Design a protein around this ligand. Structure first.
Ligand code: MAN
Length: 36
């Protein structure tokens, strides 16, 4: 699970894309997405 305020999967990020429960993966930019 990706941490809170962490990048959860933009184009090119194939790591922890699944946010911790309670946090939502919000795509902010095409490559920048953050678990909030
Ligand atoms: C939360 O923690 C993860 C690693 O555990 C980071 O990838 C993220 O940027 C944030 O610091």
């Amino acid at each position: 699970t990706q941490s809170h305020y962490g990048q959860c999967g933009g184009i090119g990020y194939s790591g922890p894309t699944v946010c911790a429960s309670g946090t939502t993966c919000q795509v902010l930019n095409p490559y920048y997405s953050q678990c909030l």
